[PDB]
Amino acid sequence: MASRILLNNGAKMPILGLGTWKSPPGQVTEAVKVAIDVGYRHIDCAHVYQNENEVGVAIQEKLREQVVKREELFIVSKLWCTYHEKGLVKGACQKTLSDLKLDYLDLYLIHWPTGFKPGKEFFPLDESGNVVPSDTNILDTWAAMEELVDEGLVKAIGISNFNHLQVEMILNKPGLKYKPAVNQIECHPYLTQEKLIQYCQSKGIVVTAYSPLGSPDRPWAKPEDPSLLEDPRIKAIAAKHNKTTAQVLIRFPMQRNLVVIPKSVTPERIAENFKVFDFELSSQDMTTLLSYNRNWRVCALLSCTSHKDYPFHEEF
């Protein structure tokens, strides 16, 4: 399959990237170096992951080594919830740029629609436990994102974990200057996201699927939770194709015209996950995988469920 998808800013985005949430800081430099050496050209990052400096060491070394050129890389990061303030967006972006050793990002996302009170804590809480919101809305934050394009800090802007009425709000913004290029959302066979994906694709927004393997390293994993990688129905499709279950789980979103960002810090798996360009799932395979939907989320931002902009009370 073609390796890149055209975005609505005119740039091409690699359809397979390396995820970095939970990648330990003492392992992620090597993970990203290995990834670039074996062909990855897209790294998904975020300030909240607390490892952008170490990701940046890898990127910089591979640029210095002339393994790749900067124009060939597609580096994504995200604006954390405590920086939804007109006066904080540029500095948040610049801190990410400084940590990643870059002078621009290919794509910068609003990480969640919910703004939180600024300060040192990523999840500022009241004495009773609930997230303390910001009064800044998704439209003013969007305007601040647009300024980053106009200042040359980022080539594209987008959103993450926006439901379709939140995407619609962005699209309907008075005076909208740049449409979102991407909506990055959780997507896998147990949370297949057909409604949100069709909405976004109909609007020309590219969808990136996160947690495509079901995030087995998520910190809140419970033994009785479903497991994609161990689902024997998925294993059977993999066996039929002489591929791993992970490889099927990665190819699946690719054939839905999605970008996909599996995370690994294991060198052998980083390579395995890239070897997804030499087989095709049939339409029957695709529909069968879609049939496994159970509306199951890895990421439900459960502390934030009263925030007025919490995304997952809406059907989609």
Ligand SMILES: NC(=O)C1=CN([C@@H]2O[C@H](COP(=O)(O)OP(=O)(O)OC[C@H]3O[C@@H](n4cnc5c(N)ncnc54)[C@H](OP(=O)(O)O)[C@@H]3O)[C@@H](O)[C@H]2O)C=CC1
């Ligand atoms: N925008 C948002 O709100 C969010 C964005 N994301 C992004 O999406 C990325 C991917 O999602 P994430 O939640 O990390 O989880 P994934 O679904 O990518 O699963 C990662 C886990 O799968 C393991 N794994 C990777 N490859 C294989 C393989 N071939 N065989 C077996 N196990 C494998 C990893 O192990 P190991 O590393 O030990 O090899 C790790 O435990 C994140 O890292 C982040 O970049 C994720 C959640 C939210």
Ligand SMILES: O=C(O)COc1cc(F)ccc1C(=S)NCc1ccc(Br)cc1F
């Ligand atoms: O967010 C991530 O990329 C991956 O996950 C995280 C990554 C981090 F580095 C820190 C927290 C999270 C959590 S707990 N994320 C879930 C989450 C956060 C905020 C809101 Br609004 C809802 C929600 F569901």
Ligand SMILES: [Cl-]
């Ligand atoms: Cl972030």
